[PDB]
Design a binder for these strands. Structure first.
Lengths: 130, 108, 267, 207, 114, 125
RNA sequence: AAACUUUCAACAACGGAUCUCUUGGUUCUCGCAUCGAUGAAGAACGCAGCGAAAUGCGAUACGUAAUGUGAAUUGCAGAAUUCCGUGAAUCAUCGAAUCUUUGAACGCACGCGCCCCUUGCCAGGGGGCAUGCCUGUUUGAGGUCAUU
RNA sequence: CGUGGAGGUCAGUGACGAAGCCUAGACCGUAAGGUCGGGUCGAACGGCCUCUAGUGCAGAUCUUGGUGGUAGUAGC
RNA sequence: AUGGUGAA
RNA sequence: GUUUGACCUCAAAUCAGGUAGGAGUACCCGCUGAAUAUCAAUAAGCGGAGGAAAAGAAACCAACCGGGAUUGCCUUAGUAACGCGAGUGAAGCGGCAAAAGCUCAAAUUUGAAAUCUGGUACCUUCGGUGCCCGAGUUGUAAUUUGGAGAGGGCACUUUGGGGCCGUUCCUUGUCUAUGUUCCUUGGAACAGGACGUCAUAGAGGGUGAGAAUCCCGUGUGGCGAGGAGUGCGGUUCUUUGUAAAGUGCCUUCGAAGAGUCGAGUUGUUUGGAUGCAGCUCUAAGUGGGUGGUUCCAUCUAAAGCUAAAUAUUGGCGAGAGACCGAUAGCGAACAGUACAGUGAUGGAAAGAUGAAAAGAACUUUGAAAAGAGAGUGAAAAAGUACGUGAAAUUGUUGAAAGGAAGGGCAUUUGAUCAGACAUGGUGUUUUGUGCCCUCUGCUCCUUGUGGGUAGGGGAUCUCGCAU
């Protein structure tokens, strides 16, 4: 093409980019355990078999736990606001454990919380504080 | 007139793309678990084949939800109904095996 | 671009030639009125010829060469399996050498045997012509006592006057170098040493760089103190080779193809 | 190029001008005008039967026939006379087929692999290679086919430990796996009887 | 040879203008003769002008420091198509519902062996 | 054999690159091996040549001649050595063009950049 | 006979046919998306000491700004260099400037107007004033409703 | 029989001269052609089994390039 | 036939 | 009110913040479009985008024990179907490549338009905050998109943001082996032989002719410098707010794209009878669309977004060819240049000197062409008309022959070319030797009708050689 010949003749120079080799090489970037054990010399399927993992869940087309223990071991590696705490304390003082009476408190139960929610919050407060 | 000189090139590109996906998706197997399917067209009904995704009923019977199942690598298809007990049982067993074989890392 | 290069230089050469011609004409015209300036310019401009750029015992003569006290008998033969051309050249050898005896090659008498037989017969020198094709290519000369010998390559052999019976006069040129004068002495002792000037016969050897030209001419003088000459038949050029210094032992100057690169010293 | 030759405006003059009816470029002044165009016989014209890209390049071969050819090539290596007729200097091999210990596969340095090959008897073939290296004859000199040389010994291994890399640099020597056993390498030029060196582990795995 | 830019960086506007005027006068004087010094003075003039322009541009940037909608001259020259193609923040914008869904069921990392 | 997929062994491409290589690359191209005596001293095989570097002639008709270099003709890929000159018919003396690859450096010219390069290339001083 | 017509060996002219090669063309394969009012492609005029083509550049004009290399460039003259050094190359990278008149071409047109400002009635000096449409600010005019 | 290219083989040929060209030189064959003797030339080419094709010219009022009689003529 | 060129 | 305000509408400003043309065009999308069936939804023309575009998660395919986004390939298949004539020609299923689902309209946040654009001052600046201005109520946020979903109650489960270093990617510099040893030739050794060394480096190029070891380079690793990002592992500050979601159960409710579907007619496409398109009319909500023997099977159109496998003769950057070789290959290896045309357009010819110019110093004849000497140079049978120089054709020397010549059979004469460094073989007779006689040894296999190699003694000796 005309533009290609002009660029070749121009003294600006080509913006050379060499990345063919980088297409073959891909570094694992989603797990630290695999990276230490992964071997780039082998293929994806071979690497998965070496690690002890499945690279395909469906019957693959065409013909065909020393590391998983680390993954399993890797598996073994909220409170109440101050205003919420004060509101809970007020109701607890005014009604104690009388959940039914606490429900009908018009001027302390500003939000009509259910008996279950009130008792759960009070139990959480008691466990956290007493 | 198109000649598939790139056949080898296309295969190499597909392999490189799969390797890149594995590098990004190293922990996972690159595939979503698919259910067993019986085909229509009696000429092929004898053949059992993989489907798109498990039905909502199968996912419920497997002890997990579709929203949670998708995040674990289970294909969910809400369009397919269920009219065969054997296929439903096979899909449930496959899902149970998948759940018993999968390992999930903590989010912490 | 070929066209640009050809056109540019074509015009350049024309202008250069024009300038050279104009300068030469002006210089000649101005020198006509100033003759001394021409002499000064000629003195300041040397032609730098190849000749001008050259890059820098009585017992021996008697012992390794013939002398007038005894005429030298020269043994003439030919290499084995010789043919008509060799005998034709031997005819000229007889016509030019003083005392020659021709003997057919016996094909098996070693060089030592030939030398012994020649000593038995009191021969003085051995000359043998060698051929490869139907042409003479080389010539050799060996002296019997102490075995000083020389080997010469032959080229440009060409067959117009008829030489007389008189012995041609011997003249040598350009043998200043020590090696050259050895070949000059060989020629002076192999060719007749008794001039018979009457009959105006002359034989000349003329070396320029490495080749020696042998020719015969008749010379006649005129009142203008100049001598004219006419070709007396054969043309001959020779090239010295192998300078054995013995019958076949202890070569001293044998030429090598690797030489001649210097372009000078004219061995 | 398909567009080659078509990049010219020319039309036939028909008759009456007492000239060839081949179409000629119009216009004037340039000089190309009046010259033949579109003709295979014309200078700079459209070559007859241009080579198209959809010509057949690969040949389908039955898998069974391919295996038969590979088996025949492998068998041919067992005959010393057949291998000798192939041009390999196997006159000094201690045994045929040549069987070597598996430790050969573990060699990492070419200096040791070449010494082992020389000691076992392959020295003659290695000398034959690197000697017949001659410059390419014909126009191939400047098509990346500049140099050519005779094939060297073939090494067959069951597992790769470094021998494939150690032997790649020594000219003539080639390494292949028992599973592959390339026919193009076993019988280069369609000529059977290549000098092949096998490891005892590879010898067992051949069965 | 000639003036050095690293020396002219610290010169003031008035000093740079005086140097430029002197160099222009020298060039005008040399033009009458018609001589590599002409090239040196020409290069010095260009260097002084470039230094002055650089100082002026940084001053303009300083006066427009931090405030929105700076002059288009100082704006990025990347390309016409990159001023469009909504910036990173706009592209990353996500509805609250999608964020809630992602938080509730984030994509998990897992392997299938046991 | 070459294993990298980013490097091409094409004769045409290499020839084009060599002839069209810029002066910066030609500097690397015009390398000259060091003398065996100098190799032991600096522990380096070859270094780029420069003006003041002293070199020895190992090939060509001028074999055995030595002298201080005077110019590095990068455009012509040739270098000039002092006292190595031709004699024209008119008496004018023209330096003979020599290739650095056919010459051996006998005495290097030491500068700060050359000293840094020597250390960079594993040498010693 | 000489002269002259014709066949052939040698010598002396055309042309580059044969042989060798190429910073070329063509074809196959692979990575990526990269023009423009913050002024695209294209055209005209100028710039190197000497200049045909090509390339580069825009009155900062075969370049200016910045980093790497470390001692050049070269057809000729010319420069130097403190060259143990913030430093030369027509070197490489290239993110900072300049970027003549046209050209989507953009003040009005088929010559030629206005805001601005300035250093000295009047002028040098510096940037803009083209048409379609989106959001916001300013002004002006006109239909409904209110006006105890 | 011959040519462009490719796989194989001659541990082939070659600056002590490969290819091409010339040659009132010779040998071989019924021939496509091969080989050797001598001159210019300079750097690549060939003996043989296969594969491959833009593979072999006496003309197509055939294409490019080159040169003769016409003719030192018509004519200027 | 498609798209353009100049021409009263 | 013989007035003053709310808006709505319409104009203007050298207003502030913005975008649009056009270029390129191989591929993509739409319109149009030739030379009643065929070239043909081609050629040409116009408009609109990107690295891909379009399409895309069914008013689907099927009548089966059913499959479940779109896209590309094989298969289906040259079959069904049609024009039954030449001919055109599908699609489901099946296998493969790659897989991801979502967002609005629809039912009250009304116990708080909770939403958003712009101006202003800061900071940690592809943005955040305090304030103001304006849009919004003729609806801006959250909650729901049929897989249902929403208000409540019962046992429970869960949770994010910003910096730092590493990690990965892009740009880019650098380190990382061995002869120039000897001999022959050559102008030059990069040619042959001998002696050597490295090889995860014998791919390639340059160096006075074919170079691993002369250089640049290549194999593998190390050391750096400048940018991207949160694909993630540590590191550090924060959360909070009676905040937002999920699981199972009980309870009360529970919306769905109209000048749209559809029929009629007229133009158009299909091998499909479908679809596209001017216009009269114009549909229903346990409703509507697609298919068959009483209807049974499957979805919910008249809104939109979405990477992947898919095309690619343009652009940038790379790896290669059983490709062509200056009359080939792109028209152009030194050109879209010279040149022709008022114009749209057409459009060429041309590569190589020599290692290097060492490009003929200098003398000499010519107004000028270039000659003769002279020299450089491996060569001038390489002199810038330069790597090599055949025919057609032209001039000279020589031979021959003479209103023609050309070829075949056989031969004379003239000229001229080849025409064995063949110099042997046999039996006999002296002399000196060894591998020959004898004595004494060493060494390789296997084992054998052998091979190789030594130290003492002679001419029983022709076993061979030389005389």
């Amino acid at each position: 093409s005309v533009r290609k010949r002009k660029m070749n003749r121009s003294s600006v120079g080509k913006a050379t980019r060499r990345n063919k080799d980088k297409q073959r090489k891909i570094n694992i970037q989603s797990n630290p355990i695999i990276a230490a054990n992964w071997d780039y010399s082998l293929t994806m399927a071979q690497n998965y078999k070496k690690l002890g993992l499945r690279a395909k869940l469906q019957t693959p087309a065409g013909g065909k736990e020393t590391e998983v223990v680390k993954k399993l071991e890797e598996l073994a590696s909220r409170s109440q606001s101050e205003r919420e705490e004060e509101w809970l304390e007020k109701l607890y003082k005014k009604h104690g454990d009388d959940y039914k009476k606490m429900f009908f408190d018009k001027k302390l139960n500003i939000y009509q919380q259910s008996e279950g929610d009130l008792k759960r919050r009070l139990l959480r407060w008691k466990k956290r504080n007493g | 007139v198109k000649v598939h000189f790139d056949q080898a090139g296309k295969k190499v590109s597909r392999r490189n793309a799969r390797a890149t996906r594995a590098a990004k998706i190293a922990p996972r197997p690159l595939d979503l678990l698919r259910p067993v399917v019986r085909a229509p067209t009696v000429k092929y009904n004898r053949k059992v084949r993989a489907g798109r995704g498990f039905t909502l009923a199968e996912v419920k019977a497997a002890g997990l939800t579709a929203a949670y199942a998708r995040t674990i690598g289970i294909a969910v298809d809400h369009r397919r109904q269920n009219r065969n007990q054997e296929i439903f049982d096979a899909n449930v067993q496959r899902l149970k095996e998948y759940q018993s074989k999968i390992i999930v890392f903590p989010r912490n | 671009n070929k066209l640009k290069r050809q056109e540019i230089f074509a015009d350049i050469k024309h202008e250069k030639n024009k300038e050279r011609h104009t300068m030469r004409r002006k210089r000649a015209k101005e020198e006509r009125e100033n003759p001394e300036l021409r002499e000064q310019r000629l003195k300041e401009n040397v032609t730098q010829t190849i000749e001008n750029t050259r890059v820098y015992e009585d017992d021996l003569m008697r012992y390794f060469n013939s002398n007038s006290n005894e005429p030298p008998k020269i043994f003439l033969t030919t290499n084995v399996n010789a043919k008509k051309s060799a005998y034709e050249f031997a005819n000229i050898l007889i016509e030019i050498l003083p005392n020659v005896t021709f003997v057919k090659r016996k094909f098996g008498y070693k060089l030592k045997e030939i030398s012994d037989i020649c000593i038995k017969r009191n021969f003085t020198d051995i000359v043998i012509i060698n051929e490869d094709k139907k042409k003479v290519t080389g010539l050799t000369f060996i002296h019997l006592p102490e075995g000083p010998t020389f080997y010469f390559k032959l080229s440009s052999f060409v067959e117009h006057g008829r030489p007389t019976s008189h012995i041609p006069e011997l003249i040598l040129n350009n043998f200043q170098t020590r090696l050259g004068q050895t070949v000059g002495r060989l020629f002076q002792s192999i060719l007749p040493q008794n001039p018979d000037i009457e009959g105006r016969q002359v034989i000349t050897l003329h070396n320029q760089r490495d080749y020696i030209f042998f020719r015969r001419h008749r010379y006649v003088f005129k009142d203008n103190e100049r001598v004219g000459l006419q070709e007396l038949g054969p043309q001959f050029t020779l090239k010295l080779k192998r300078l054995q210094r013995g019958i076949k032992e202890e070569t001293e100057w044998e030429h090598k193809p690797e030489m001649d690169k210097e372009k000078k010293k004219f061995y | 190029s398909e567009k080659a030759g078509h990049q010219t405006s020319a039309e036939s003059w028909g008759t009456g001008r007492a000239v060839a009816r081949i179409p000629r470029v119009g216009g004037g002044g340039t000089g190309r005008s009046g010259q033949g165009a579109f003709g295979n016989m014309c200078r700079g014209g459209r070559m007859f039967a241009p080579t198209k890209t959809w010509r057949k390049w690969n040949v389908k071969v039955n898998h069974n026939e391919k295996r038969y050819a590979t088996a025949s090539a492998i068998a041919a290596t067992a005959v010393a006379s057949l291998v000798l007729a192939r041009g390999h200097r196997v006159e000094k091999i201690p045994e045929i087929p040549l069987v070597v210990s598996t430790d050969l596969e573990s060699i990492q340095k070419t200096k040791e692999a070449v010494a082992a090959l020389k000691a076992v008897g392959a020295h003659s073939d290695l000398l034959k290679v690197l000697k017949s290296k001659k410059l390419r004859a014909g126009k191939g000199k400047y098509r990346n086919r500049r140099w050519t040389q005779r094939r060297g010994p073939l090494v067959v291994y069951a597992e790769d430990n470094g021998i494939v890399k150690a032997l790649r640099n020594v000219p003539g020597v080639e390494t292949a796996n028992v599973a592959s056993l390339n026919l193009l390498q076993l019988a280069p030029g369609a000529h059977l009887g290549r000098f092949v060196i096998w490891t005892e582990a590879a010898f067992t795995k051949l069965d | 040879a000639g003036v050095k830019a690293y020396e002219l960086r610290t010169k003031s506007k008035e000093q740079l203008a005086s140097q430029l005027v002197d160099l222009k006068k020298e060039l005008a004087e040399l033009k009458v003769q018609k001589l590599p010094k002409i090239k040196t003075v020409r290069k010095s003039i260009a260097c002084v002008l470039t230094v002055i322009n650089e100082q002026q541009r940084e001053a303009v940037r300083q006066l427009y420091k931090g405030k929105k909608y700076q002059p288009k001259d100082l704006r990025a020259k990347k390309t016409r198509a990159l001023r469009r193609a909504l910036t990173k923040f706009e592209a990353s914008q996500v509805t609250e519902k999608q964020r809630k869904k992602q938080i509730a069921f984030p994509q998990r990392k897992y392997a299938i062996k046991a | 054999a070459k294993q990298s997929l980013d490097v091409s062994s094409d004769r045409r491409k290499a020839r084009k690159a060599y002839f069209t290589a810029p002066s910066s690359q030609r500097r690397v191209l015009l390398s000259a091996p060091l003398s065996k005596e100098l190799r032991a001293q600096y522990g380096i095989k070859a270094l780029p040549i420069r003006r003041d570097d002293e070199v020895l002639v190992v090939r060509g008709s001028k074999k055995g001649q030595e002298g201080k270099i005077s110019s590095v003709y990068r455009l012509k890929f040739a270098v000039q050595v002092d006292k190595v000159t031709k004699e024209k018919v008119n008496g004018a003396s023209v330096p003979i063009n020599l290739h650095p690859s056919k010459l051996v450096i006998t005495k290097l010219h030491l500068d700060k950049d050359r000293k840094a390069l020597i250390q960079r290339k594993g040498g010693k001083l």
